[PDB]
Scaffold this active site. Structure first.
Site, PDB file in Angstrom:
ATOM      1  N   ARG A   3     -15.945  26.685 -35.453  1.00  0.00           N
ATOM      2  CA  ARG A   3     -16.720  27.805 -36.296  1.00  0.00           C
ATOM      3  C   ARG A   3     -16.543  29.143 -35.348  1.00  0.00           C
ATOM      4  O   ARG A   3     -17.379  29.882 -34.905  1.00  0.00           O
ATOM      5  CB  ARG A   3     -17.865  27.178 -36.697  1.00  0.00           C
ATOM      6  CG  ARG A   3     -18.071  26.392 -37.823  1.00  0.00           C
ATOM      7  CD  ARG A   3     -19.615  25.903 -37.790  1.00  0.00           C
ATOM      8  NE  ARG A   3     -19.997  25.647 -36.459  1.00  0.00           N
ATOM      9  CZ  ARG A   3     -20.028  24.551 -35.964  1.00  0.00           C
ATOM     10  NH1 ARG A   3     -19.489  23.624 -36.517  1.00  0.00           N
ATOM     11  NH2 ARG A   3     -20.599  24.066 -34.459  1.00  0.00           N
ATOM     12  N   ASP A  31     -19.917  18.410 -31.338  1.00  0.00           N
ATOM     13  CA  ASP A  31     -20.049  19.022 -32.667  1.00  0.00           C
ATOM     14  C   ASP A  31     -20.433  18.465 -34.082  1.00  0.00           C
ATOM     15  O   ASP A  31     -21.224  18.804 -34.712  1.00  0.00           O
ATOM     16  CB  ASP A  31     -18.908  20.303 -32.910  1.00  0.00           C
ATOM     17  CG  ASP A  31     -19.094  21.233 -33.691  1.00  0.00           C
ATOM     18  OD1 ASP A  31     -20.576  22.003 -33.634  1.00  0.00           O
ATOM     19  OD2 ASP A  31     -18.512  21.739 -34.214  1.00  0.00           O
ATOM     20  N   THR A  32     -19.791  17.411 -34.208  1.00  0.00           N
ATOM     21  CA  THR A  32     -19.909  16.646 -35.490  1.00  0.00           C
ATOM     22  C   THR A  32     -21.405  15.971 -35.582  1.00  0.00           C
ATOM     23  O   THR A  32     -22.107  16.400 -36.564  1.00  0.00           O
ATOM     24  CB  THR A  32     -18.450  15.544 -35.559  1.00  0.00           C
ATOM     25  OG1 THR A  32     -18.571  14.796 -34.430  1.00  0.00           O
ATOM     26  CG2 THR A  32     -17.431  16.239 -35.970  1.00  0.00           C
ATOM     27  N   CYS A  64     -11.583   8.246 -37.071  1.00  0.00           N
ATOM     28  CA  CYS A  64     -12.486   8.648 -35.924  1.00  0.00           C
ATOM     29  C   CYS A  64     -12.717   7.613 -34.974  1.00  0.00           C
ATOM     30  O   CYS A  64     -13.094   6.330 -35.331  1.00  0.00           O
ATOM     31  CB  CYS A  64     -13.790   9.052 -36.762  1.00  0.00           C
ATOM     32  SG  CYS A  64     -15.005   9.608 -35.376  1.00  0.00           S
ATOM     33  N   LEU A  65     -12.433   7.844 -33.728  1.00  0.00           N
ATOM     34  CA  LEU A  65     -12.684   6.787 -32.846  1.00  0.00           C
ATOM     35  C   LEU A  65     -14.228   6.570 -32.211  1.00  0.00           C
ATOM     36  O   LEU A  65     -14.737   5.703 -31.909  1.00  0.00           O
ATOM     37  CB  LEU A  65     -11.943   6.785 -31.556  1.00  0.00           C
ATOM     38  CG  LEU A  65     -10.454   6.189 -31.826  1.00  0.00           C
ATOM     39  CD1 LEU A  65      -9.697   7.116 -30.692  1.00  0.00           C
ATOM     40  CD2 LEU A  65     -10.271   5.102 -31.366  1.00  0.00           C
ATOM     41  N   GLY A  66     -15.034   7.933 -32.576  1.00  0.00           N
ATOM     42  CA  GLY A  66     -16.278   7.919 -32.304  1.00  0.00           C
ATOM     43  C   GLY A  66     -16.969   7.442 -33.371  1.00  0.00           C
ATOM     44  O   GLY A  66     -18.399   7.949 -33.402  1.00  0.00           O
TER      45      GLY A  66
HETATM   46  C1  HEM Z   1     -20.441  12.508 -37.786  1.00  0.00           C
HETATM   47  C2  HEM Z   1     -19.763  12.341 -36.784  1.00  0.00           C
HETATM   48  C3  HEM Z   1     -18.297  12.632 -36.831  1.00  0.00           C
HETATM   49  C4  HEM Z   1     -17.330  12.708 -37.783  1.00  0.00           C
HETATM   50  C5  HEM Z   1     -17.628  12.914 -39.251  1.00  0.00           C
HETATM   51  C6  HEM Z   1     -15.842  12.660 -37.400  1.00  0.00           C
HETATM   52  C7  HEM Z   1     -14.906  12.703 -37.921  1.00  0.00           C
HETATM   53  C8  HEM Z   1     -13.773  12.661 -37.390  1.00  0.00           C
HETATM   54  C9  HEM Z   1     -12.356  12.826 -38.226  1.00  0.00           C
HETATM   55  C10 HEM Z   1     -12.423  13.116 -39.761  1.00  0.00           C
HETATM   56  C11 HEM Z   1     -11.276  12.592 -37.403  1.00  0.00           C
HETATM   57  C12 HEM Z   1      -9.803  12.695 -37.647  1.00  0.00           C
HETATM   58  C13 HEM Z   1      -9.231  14.092 -37.864  1.00  0.00           C
HETATM   59  C14 HEM Z   1      -7.799  14.098 -37.972  1.00  0.00           C
HETATM   60  O1  HEM Z   1      -7.290  13.108 -38.967  1.00  0.00           O
HETATM   61  O2  HEM Z   1      -7.139  15.026 -37.749  1.00  0.00           O
HETATM   62  C15 HEM Z   1     -11.804  12.165 -36.030  1.00  0.00           C
HETATM   63  C16 HEM Z   1     -11.184  11.855 -35.269  1.00  0.00           C
HETATM   64  C17 HEM Z   1     -11.539  11.413 -33.910  1.00  0.00           C
HETATM   65  N1  HEM Z   1     -12.850  11.527 -33.443  1.00  0.00           N
HETATM   66 FE1  HEM Z   1     -14.570  11.719 -34.651  1.00  0.00          FE
HETATM   67  N2  HEM Z   1     -16.197  12.402 -36.056  1.00  0.00           N
HETATM   68  C18 HEM Z   1     -17.365  12.126 -35.612  1.00  0.00           C
HETATM   69  C19 HEM Z   1     -17.838  11.767 -34.420  1.00  0.00           C
HETATM   70  C20 HEM Z   1     -17.130  11.801 -33.136  1.00  0.00           C
HETATM   71  C21 HEM Z   1     -17.627  11.373 -31.894  1.00  0.00           C
HETATM   72  C22 HEM Z   1     -19.321  11.326 -31.512  1.00  0.00           C
HETATM   73  C23 HEM Z   1     -16.658  11.287 -30.960  1.00  0.00           C
HETATM   74  C24 HEM Z   1     -16.853  10.953 -29.538  1.00  0.00           C
HETATM   75  C25 HEM Z   1     -16.191  11.804 -28.445  1.00  0.00           C
HETATM   76  C26 HEM Z   1     -15.439  11.440 -31.821  1.00  0.00           C
HETATM   77  C27 HEM Z   1     -14.225  11.292 -31.357  1.00  0.00           C
HETATM   78  C28 HEM Z   1     -13.053  11.256 -31.905  1.00  0.00           C
HETATM   79  C29 HEM Z   1     -11.722  10.996 -31.697  1.00  0.00           C
HETATM   80  C30 HEM Z   1     -11.434  10.778 -30.046  1.00  0.00           C
HETATM   81  C31 HEM Z   1     -10.793  11.428 -32.917  1.00  0.00           C
HETATM   82  C32 HEM Z   1      -9.325  11.347 -32.751  1.00  0.00           C
HETATM   83  C33 HEM Z   1      -8.514  10.105 -33.400  1.00  0.00           C
HETATM   84  C34 HEM Z   1      -6.864  10.049 -33.312  1.00  0.00           C
HETATM   85  O3  HEM Z   1      -6.412  11.175 -33.310  1.00  0.00           O
HETATM   86  O4  HEM Z   1      -6.425   8.908 -33.208  1.00  0.00           O
HETATM   87  N3  HEM Z   1     -15.622  11.651 -33.202  1.00  0.00           N
HETATM   88  N4  HEM Z   1     -13.186  12.186 -36.276  1.00  0.00           N
HETATM   89  C1  LIG Z   2     -11.387  17.018 -36.764  1.00  0.00           C
HETATM   90  C2  LIG Z   2     -12.156  16.592 -35.488  1.00  0.00           C
HETATM   91  C3  LIG Z   2     -13.711  16.433 -35.669  1.00  0.00           C
HETATM   92  C4  LIG Z   2     -11.454  15.475 -34.677  1.00  0.00           C
HETATM   93  C5  LIG Z   2     -12.384  15.221 -33.576  1.00  0.00           C
HETATM   94  C6  LIG Z   2     -12.716  16.493 -33.139  1.00  0.00           C
HETATM   95  C7  LIG Z   2     -12.070  17.394 -34.244  1.00  0.00           C
HETATM   96  C8  LIG Z   2     -12.577  18.800 -34.101  1.00  0.00           C
HETATM   97  C9  LIG Z   2     -10.673  17.364 -33.892  1.00  0.00           C
HETATM   98  O1  LIG Z   2     -10.254  18.412 -33.091  1.00  0.00           O
HETATM   99  C10 LIG Z   2     -10.320  16.048 -34.132  1.00  0.00           C
END
Ligand code: HEM
Ligand SMILES: CC1(C)[C@@H]2CC[C@@]1(C)C(=O)C2
Ligand SMILES: [K+]
Length: 404
Positions: free
Chosen positions: A176, A241-242, A347-349
């Site tokens: 942001r 952030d998320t 999402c892996l997280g």
């Molecule tokens: C409410 C919390 C969260 C939401 C809504 C969320 C949502 C997402 C989404 C929408 C994507 C895919 C983006 C794309 O396709 O370009 C993503 C990917 C990912 N998220 Fe999350 N996320 C959350 C929390 C987290 C957390 C806590 C972590 C841990 C560090 C994390 C790690 C990742 C990673 C490593 C990816 C990459 C997957 C890949 O590119 O194969 N996320 N997340």
């Molecule tokens: C769109 C996202 C939530 C997903 C994990 C972090 C994020 C900002 C990206 O850069 C990948």
């Protein structure tokens, strides 16, 4: 507003700005759902932020996230220069190549690791909530939403809490931007921070997330320092952030809605179901992809190199996916959403997030069952790659609370 490209027609121009949407004052999800009015086409072109496509419906968003031969992750952010500079791993890669790296990322943030962190996540949430309970008030964003998820990620990553303010500042600029930093400048700053640590942890491998990535193997060969840096960086952004913003949305909602509070206090085993329905209603991410070639999608000609925003937020807000989508229903039978993405980059997280979300609801509601927005407060939201809440002043009467 960028001058319209020859191949885009006049009638699909919908000048939405994703970093500063028009109806934002009504709530950021509502601001995005103006794209789903009766008078807006399924796929529109905005001239804002350098110019790009916006798919507004969940059917189109899912299909574009599935078709990685046409919609590539190589440039996934808007504006184009942030998308070009974006080189995090696994997200800037497409399958087949993406797959080796994701498995490694999955080993440091997956379900087995949520299981190891179970005790600390529980402890910290009880702890922070207990600390706030007697005051009868808090600044939720600052007092819980930030510190709870962030200190659990700093813990996993083995990084000192004194680094939070620098790191959270850089992460926010990537999602942001306030104008002070370009996406590229923020990213470089984050890599600069991680370089030495990765090297130290390559020499003396430990148990923390950085060591595990940095000494990892990608389908049997050793990760390079460079690839470890680009995976670690993603991990920090993802952990900083998320969840943080998501918790604020959910708590803002519960603060305005006594009946929903009463439902989870009466029936706490409904908390997992309510978390999923909140993730649908208060979905907050919107990134996108780039066309690998000319392609015709749902009657619109897309040009090779064209960017397309595929708001993961829009799919469960779509009335074609869920009846009365702006309505929160914990008993909703088929809660459909793309909040955690869709396709190969799921999402892996997401297991770590759901655990933080459920623990927060249970442990907050257990100690501070009744609470409201501070009198006279007007909550402001913010939009971008991740949307969020500017500040959330909550109040409650301590006499109604309990120490557990
Ligand atoms: C409410 C919390 C969260 C939401 C809504 C969320 C949502 C997402 C989404 C929408 C994507 C895919 C983006 C794309 O396709 O370009 C993503 C990917 C990912 N998220 Fe999350 N996320 C959350 C929390 C987290 C957390 C806590 C972590 C841990 C560090 C994390 C790690 C990742 C990673 C490593 C990816 C990459 C997957 C890949 O590119 O194969 N996320 N997340
Ligand atoms: C769109 C996202 C939530 C997903 C994990 C972090 C994020 C900002 C990206 O850069 C990948
Ligand atoms: K790129």
């Amino acid at each position: 507003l960028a001058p319209l490209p020859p191949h885009v027609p006049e009638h699909l121009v919908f000048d939405f700005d994703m970093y500063n949407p028009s109806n934002l004052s009504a709530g950021v999800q509502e601001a995005w759902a103006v794209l789903q009015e009766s008078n807006v086409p399924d796929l529109v072109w905005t001239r804002c932020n350098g110019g790009h496509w916006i798919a507004t419906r969940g059917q189109l968003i899912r299909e574009a996230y599935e078709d990685y031969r046409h919609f590539s992750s190589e440039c996934p952010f808007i504006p184009r220069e942030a998308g070009e500079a974006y080189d995090f791993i696994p997200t800037s890669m497409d399958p087949p190549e993406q797959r080796q790296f994701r498995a490694l990322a999955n080993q440091v943030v997956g379900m087995p690791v949520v299981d190891k962190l179970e005790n600390r996540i529980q402890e910290l949430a009880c702890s922070l909530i207990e600390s706030l309970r007697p005051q009868g008030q808090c600044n939720f964003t600052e007092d819980y939403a930030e510190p709870f998820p962030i200190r659990i990620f700093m813990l996993l990553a083995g990084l000192p809490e004194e680094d939070i303010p620098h790191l959270k500042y850089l992460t926010d600029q990537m999602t942001r931007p306030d104008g002070s930093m370009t996406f590229a400048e923020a990213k470089e700053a984050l890599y600069d921070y991680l370089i030495p640590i990765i090297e130290q942890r390559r020499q003396k491998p430990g148990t923390d997330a950085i060591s595990i990535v940095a000494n990892g193997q990608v389908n049997g060969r050793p990760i390079t320092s460079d690839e470890a840096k680009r995976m670690c960086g993603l991990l920090l952004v993802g952990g900083l952030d998320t969840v943080v913003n998501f918790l604020s949305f959910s708590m803002e909602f519960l603060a305005k809605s006594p009946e929903h509070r009463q439902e989870l206090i009466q029936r706490p085993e409904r908390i997992p179901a309510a978390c999923e329905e909140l993730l649908r209603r208060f979905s907050l991410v919107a990134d996108g992809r780039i066309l690998t070639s000319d392609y015709e999608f749902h009657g619109v000609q897309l040009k090779k190199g064209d960017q397309i925003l595929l708001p993961q937020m829009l799919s469960g807000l779509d009335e074609r996916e869920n009846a009365c989508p702006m309505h929160v229903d914990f008993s909703r039978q088929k809660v459909s959403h793309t909040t955690f993405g869709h396709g190969s980059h799921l999402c892996l997280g997401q297991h770590l997030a759901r655990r933080e979300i459920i623990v927060t609801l249970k442990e907050w509601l257990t100690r501070i069952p009744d609470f409201s927005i501070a009198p006279g407060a007007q909550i402001q939201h913010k939009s971008g790659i991740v949307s969020g809440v500017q500040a959330l002043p909550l109040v409650w009467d301590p006499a109604t609370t309990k120490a557990v």
